[PDB]
Amino acid sequence: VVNEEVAPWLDLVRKLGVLAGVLSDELPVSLSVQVRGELAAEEVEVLRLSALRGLFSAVIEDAVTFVNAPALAAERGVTAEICKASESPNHRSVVDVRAVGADGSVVTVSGTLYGPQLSQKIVQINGRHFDLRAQGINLIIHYVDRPGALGKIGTLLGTAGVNIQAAQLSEDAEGPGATILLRLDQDVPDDVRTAIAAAVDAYKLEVVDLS
Amino acid sequence: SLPVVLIADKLAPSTVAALGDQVEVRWVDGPDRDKLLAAVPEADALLVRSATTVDAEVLAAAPKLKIVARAGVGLDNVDVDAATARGVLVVNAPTSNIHSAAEHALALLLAASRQIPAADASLREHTWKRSSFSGTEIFGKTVGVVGLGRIGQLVAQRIAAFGAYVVAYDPYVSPARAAQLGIELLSLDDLLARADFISVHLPKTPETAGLIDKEALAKTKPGVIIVNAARGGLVDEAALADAITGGHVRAAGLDVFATEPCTDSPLFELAQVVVTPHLGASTAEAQDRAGTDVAESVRLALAGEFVPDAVNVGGGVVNEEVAPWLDLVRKLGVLAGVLSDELPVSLSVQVRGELAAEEVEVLRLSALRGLFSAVIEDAVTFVNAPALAAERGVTAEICKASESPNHRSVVDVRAVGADGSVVTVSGTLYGPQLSQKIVQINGRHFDLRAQGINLIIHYVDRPGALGKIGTLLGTAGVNIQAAQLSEDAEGPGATILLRLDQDVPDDVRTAIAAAVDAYKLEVVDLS
Amino acid sequence: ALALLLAASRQIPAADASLREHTWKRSSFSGTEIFGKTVGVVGLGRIGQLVAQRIAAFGAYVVAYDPYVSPARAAQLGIELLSLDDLLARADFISVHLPKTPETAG
Amino acid sequence: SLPVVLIADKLAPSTVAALGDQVEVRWVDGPDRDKLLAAVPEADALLVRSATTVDAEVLAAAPKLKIVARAGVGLDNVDVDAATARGVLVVNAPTSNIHSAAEHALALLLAASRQIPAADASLREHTWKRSSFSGTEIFGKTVGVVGLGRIGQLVAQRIAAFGAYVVAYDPYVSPARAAQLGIELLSLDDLLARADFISVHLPKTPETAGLIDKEALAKTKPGVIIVNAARGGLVDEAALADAITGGHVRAAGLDVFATEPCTDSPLFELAQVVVTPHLGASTAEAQDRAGTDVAESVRLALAGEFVPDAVNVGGGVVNEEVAPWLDLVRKLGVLAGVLSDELPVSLSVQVRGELAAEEVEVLRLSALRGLFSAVIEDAVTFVNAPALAAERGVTAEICKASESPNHRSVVDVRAVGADGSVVTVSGTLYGPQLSQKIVQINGRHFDLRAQGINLIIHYVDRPGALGKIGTLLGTAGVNIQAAQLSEDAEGPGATILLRLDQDVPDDVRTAIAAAVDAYKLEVVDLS
């Protein structure tokens, strides 16, 4: 039995997996799922599968099933780990999916669920904090903070007929950079991604479907 | 072992008899550094006026000091930050001068309209220039009071008995309260247009400074008489001089100056401007009231009772768990105030989650302090809730709930309007540094540093709005540190909040408004 | 009458003068507060009646000497009627006025 | 000589320990006439529940009786008029049942939606009819609370934790207060349309009686469940029965009946209606709270202190000069309330002239009692101002002024709205009989008996209006005793007030409105 407390997290952690993957430039060699807070008292093994399954759909043709995935990860040299800690520093419960590349680079993505609807929310990308619905087409940009930056991103999207349903932009604690997330009403043509990316000096720019 | 109360400035024992006979009162020459520092070591309480300075050095030499009390209203001679840092309760006497100061405003209004000092001078010179003078009758006239706190209220009441109609401008008094006072509340523009007399009664804050400038002085009634017994440079001194000379304002009374110790204002060369050297509180009765007020405050303090005239936090008065929440809640009040169309009648402070297990009444006061900070002076952290309710018409309450939907603890500050609408703003602290985060505004969720200059825009024209907004800000040279924006759940509206690296010029505000078609455009400094 | 009571109470002329000769003698002045004091009005013809109502609004108690004024009218102006002697004993401020009976005024 | 406290009904000493040891408590069998009358002569205080009747005979036999206290909420068994007449303070325990009664409303809501009594009965009969039952979930549903006083507030709060949205109808709660409660205020029509559950929480007054009739029951949502744990016939019993049978309302819970001792309601023949014999307060905890409340009240009374739970006037508590002003001021509150567009946030009571020399705080309470009398029960003359402010959002203050412009003494009751507008109504007493006169409404002056049915009309079509109004009233057979009417100082409006000899039918009201083109048409009984 997947426990009633645990079930609603499945689809979320899958999406954190999708996110950790699209956001990794190279296929990760390790995937680590950390369960913190109230959730940590449940049986969350199945969330490791969920994350992996998410990781691999973002990379491999013909999406993975649930018993399909562990062997598929092993076969591609990806190892998975799961941690459970009662202690969560901020949210009552949060899950972090951490993907480490062969070159040692790290991507963490975190999600929670709260409210009467148990709405799924993305709440961290790499130590930047957010509260955005885990749904729809989301554009992620890590860029160089110059005057004009946010405007150029907005000008180009709008110029392309692409409407922004929500968006949140945080500034790096100790960097020259900034990272924004935008939920869009439709995909962004390649040409326009390249444009956004040159207009700001994007380290990273990805679009991901969180349906 | 009776607690020691050290009087460092010139307060007589009789002034201070409200301290029990349960204490040992001593006296010291406070201005004299070596004496003060020699005597302060054994002090439990330290009372002071203005001659003595209670800076860090004094505090560091006073190891068991529990209250610093200033018999007065200014806190200029007390480093309140340092006293807070060391756990020292600071107290003053905030209503001790209101009558002597109201009366002085009235004194100046009348002296100016009847040209008293000049007349008295003409007889002093041994001549009879009766024919040359010409006063202004108050009866039947309109008097504009700018700022309706305790003193402006006292002035309104006195002036009304002269058969003047009174109007006021004060966005920090509720309409019901002004109507209880029998005072009509106006836009500053409307006050300016209508007033035969203007008396200013604002505190000095950057929101206030120079309020009445050349542009304001030009909107007044020809023949107006203006009084400022309140603060520093509320009326632009040069604009005043110009309009006096030029004829437009007939007379004026000033008791306070842009920069005090002031012996050289050009206003001193105009006969039709009555001036006085910051008298207002200069009165045996006011100086006694100060002394006896502060004496009672020290009494309660030592008796381990609640000190309503507290200006700060010190002692067990706040748990270590709660302390860091004060400043954040202050900022929720500021923000709830800014997002409100007009002054809320009440603030509902809701504490949810782990925090709810704490003793959190001080937070209700923090919310109020923030809401009202456009009319509160920097040093003061605490406000007298019962006084603020009675003076201005606004209350606060606190509610607890075990459950917090998302974060372990969250505070929500619900600002409620007379008409029943609500503006909700929430925050948390989290992490090693316990950094302050704004997490909800009106059902919208996010995670933004509670700090810096923030631009908030409610608007109706959606497509490309991010583009327009960012591009105008960026063309103005304004960096955007962070941002949150979403399309309204119901209706054609959208809302963005941006943290900026500087303020936003007025023309650019107007541009942004026009471009996204805003109905609300605000900029609050969340420091 | 109010203007003068206030100008004398706060030493306005002497305080305005000191400024005009470019000195800051704040510490030389020391006014008298009206609030809560007892004001004696001598004579209650109309101007005195008006003075007393204006002074009441400063939160002062008003006594007056005028033996020909309607006692009901005095009460309505919130005035306690006294003999001249008693007024003089109790008065912190005194304003003298044309009385109701024009020159039995002493 | 210790004062005697006589307990005439079944209250245990422990219930009453809040009376000091400074008193001699005795007990008597109150229902037993001869015993009661034998014991009451030495009584200083008399406590009672409901079994004993404190009528004139009892009072006349109790020469030094100072308080009659009813441990409960009803005053049915106490002749309060007679006690007032003899100077006897009457007291009850007005918040002593609110929890047990809220809980019972909830009990009934749940029992009705889950068909408990019938289910329990089916198992009692030794069969398993699980398949036949079908409950109604509360989560996510809309619950309409009709009347938002203490109990409706407690019910709203309990029901909200079940994840129901709560709406209320109560014209005697301010919007700010309802919003502090997190409750949405609605017209009765809108509540009816939206509510899946309705719980009634009105007092019985003629303004209230039968509120929810056939016409209301027909506007509700199909499938609604209705509870009345409040009062008598607030929901028309026959209309209810019809709508239950007819299907439209799914279920109901009743704890009170149009005419009690009730053993024969047709509702008792419907399974889908849960009924209980006026339990609600029937609880050890509620009966104890009553006893200990009333005991404290008696304590304060004897200690010559202020009794907040007073229901009336007795003793020196009111000067002989002031006494006759109570009733008139009550009527100024009623009228200020009626002439107000919506509930004022505060009443400013201004006492001018000779009266201002008196001690007149009770008048501020009289004004409140009048303002709120649509939700106050007859016997009660006094209201608990602090309680009413906290529960409903409305305050009162009193101001004095030596001068009265015209009459020797006048009271003005200023009703102030949240938006700052003011409605002013004044009265005097004058003459041998000290007859009560209404003398001003909103700057208009006149002299009209404060008595009888009065029609007030604000209207915009002036020429011939007197003709139209009088002719319609007269065709309806309505005599006009007195009248005052004037054309508004500024604008196209006019105002008439008429004292009539009976009420005015609804069609004739509509006719008058149409004919003079009214915006305000009201009829208040100024008895």
Short mmCIF file of N, CA and C in Angstrom, two decimals, chain B residues 175-183 345-346 348 395 397 414 416-422, chain D residues 175-183 345-346 348 395 397 414 416-422:
data_model
loop_
_atom_site.label_atom_id
_atom_site.label_comp_id
_atom_site.label_asym_id
_atom_site.label_seq_id
_atom_site.Cartn_x
_atom_site.Cartn_y
_atom_site.Cartn_z
N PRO B 175 -11.99 58.28 9.33
CA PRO B 175 -13.16 59.14 9.16
C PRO B 175 -14.13 59.13 10.33
N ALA B 176 -14.49 57.96 10.87
CA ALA B 176 -15.37 57.92 12.02
C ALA B 176 -14.75 58.74 13.16
N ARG B 177 -13.46 58.63 13.35
CA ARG B 177 -12.87 59.36 14.49
C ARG B 177 -12.96 60.88 14.22
N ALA B 178 -12.71 61.29 12.99
CA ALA B 178 -12.72 62.72 12.70
C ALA B 178 -14.14 63.27 12.87
N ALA B 179 -15.11 62.50 12.40
CA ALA B 179 -16.51 62.86 12.59
C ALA B 179 -16.90 62.86 14.10
N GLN B 180 -16.43 61.92 14.89
CA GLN B 180 -16.66 62.07 16.33
C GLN B 180 -16.12 63.39 16.81
N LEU B 181 -15.00 63.81 16.26
CA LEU B 181 -14.45 65.09 16.66
C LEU B 181 -15.22 66.27 16.09
N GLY B 182 -16.10 66.04 15.13
CA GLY B 182 -16.85 67.14 14.57
C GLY B 182 -15.89 67.90 13.64
N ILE B 183 -14.90 67.19 13.09
CA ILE B 183 -13.95 67.77 12.13
C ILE B 183 -14.12 67.16 10.74
N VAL B 345 -9.45 50.23 9.76
CA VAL B 345 -9.94 50.51 11.11
C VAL B 345 -9.27 49.64 12.11
N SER B 346 -8.95 48.42 11.70
CA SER B 346 -8.23 47.51 12.58
C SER B 346 -7.21 46.67 11.85
N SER B 348 -5.95 42.79 12.22
CA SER B 348 -6.00 41.46 12.82
C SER B 348 -4.66 40.73 12.64
N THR B 395 -7.57 49.96 15.90
CA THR B 395 -7.12 48.96 16.91
C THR B 395 -6.31 47.85 16.27
N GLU B 397 -5.76 43.33 17.11
CA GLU B 397 -5.90 42.13 17.93
C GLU B 397 -4.97 41.04 17.44
N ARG B 414 -3.83 40.89 8.85
CA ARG B 414 -5.08 41.26 8.17
C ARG B 414 -5.48 42.73 8.41
N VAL B 416 -8.15 45.45 8.09
CA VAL B 416 -9.57 45.52 7.75
C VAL B 416 -10.10 46.94 7.61
N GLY B 417 -10.89 47.13 6.58
CA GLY B 417 -11.43 48.43 6.30
C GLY B 417 -12.82 48.53 6.89
N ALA B 418 -13.20 49.77 7.18
CA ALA B 418 -14.52 50.12 7.65
C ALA B 418 -15.62 49.48 6.82
N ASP B 419 -15.35 49.24 5.55
CA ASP B 419 -16.39 48.76 4.65
C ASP B 419 -16.38 47.25 4.62
N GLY B 420 -15.42 46.66 5.32
CA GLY B 420 -15.39 45.21 5.50
C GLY B 420 -14.43 44.45 4.61
N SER B 421 -13.89 45.13 3.60
CA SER B 421 -12.86 44.56 2.75
C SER B 421 -11.62 44.28 3.60
N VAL B 422 -10.76 43.36 3.14
CA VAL B 422 -9.57 42.98 3.89
C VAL B 422 -8.34 42.94 2.99
N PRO D 175 -19.77 45.81 9.53
CA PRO D 175 -18.94 45.13 8.55
C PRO D 175 -17.51 44.87 9.00
N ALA D 176 -16.83 45.86 9.59
CA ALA D 176 -15.48 45.65 10.09
C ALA D 176 -15.50 44.48 11.08
N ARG D 177 -16.50 44.42 11.93
CA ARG D 177 -16.48 43.35 12.94
C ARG D 177 -16.66 41.99 12.24
N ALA D 178 -17.54 41.93 11.25
CA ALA D 178 -17.80 40.66 10.60
C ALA D 178 -16.54 40.19 9.85
N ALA D 179 -15.88 41.14 9.20
CA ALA D 179 -14.63 40.86 8.53
C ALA D 179 -13.52 40.46 9.55
N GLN D 180 -13.44 41.09 10.71
CA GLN D 180 -12.51 40.55 11.71
C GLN D 180 -12.84 39.10 11.99
N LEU D 181 -14.12 38.77 12.00
CA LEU D 181 -14.49 37.39 12.23
C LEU D 181 -14.22 36.48 11.04
N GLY D 182 -13.93 37.06 9.87
CA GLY D 182 -13.67 36.23 8.71
C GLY D 182 -15.03 35.70 8.23
N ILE D 183 -16.10 36.46 8.50
CA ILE D 183 -17.45 36.11 8.04
C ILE D 183 -17.97 37.10 7.01
N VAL D 345 -21.07 53.14 13.51
CA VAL D 345 -19.98 52.53 14.27
C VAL D 345 -19.98 53.02 15.68
N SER D 346 -20.36 54.27 15.87
CA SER D 346 -20.45 54.82 17.21
C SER D 346 -21.63 55.75 17.38
N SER D 348 -22.21 59.25 19.45
CA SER D 348 -21.74 60.34 20.30
C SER D 348 -22.92 60.98 21.05
N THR D 395 -19.52 51.47 19.52
CA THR D 395 -19.31 52.09 20.85
C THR D 395 -20.24 53.27 21.07
N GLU D 397 -19.91 57.29 23.34
CA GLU D 397 -19.27 58.21 24.29
C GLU D 397 -20.23 59.32 24.69
N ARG D 414 -25.58 61.85 18.35
CA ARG D 414 -24.89 61.80 17.06
C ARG D 414 -24.54 60.36 16.62
N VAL D 416 -22.65 58.09 14.22
CA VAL D 416 -21.61 58.23 13.19
C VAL D 416 -21.35 56.96 12.40
N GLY D 417 -21.21 57.14 11.10
CA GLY D 417 -21.00 56.02 10.22
C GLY D 417 -19.52 55.88 9.96
N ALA D 418 -19.15 54.65 9.64
CA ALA D 418 -17.81 54.28 9.25
C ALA D 418 -17.24 55.22 8.19
N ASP D 419 -18.10 55.79 7.38
CA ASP D 419 -17.63 56.60 6.26
C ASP D 419 -17.53 58.05 6.68
N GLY D 420 -17.95 58.33 7.91
CA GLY D 420 -17.76 59.66 8.48
C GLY D 420 -18.98 60.56 8.48
N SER D 421 -20.01 60.16 7.74
CA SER D 421 -21.28 60.86 7.74
C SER D 421 -21.88 60.79 9.15
N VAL D 422 -22.77 61.73 9.48
CA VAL D 422 -23.37 61.77 10.81
C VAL D 422 -24.88 61.97 10.72
#
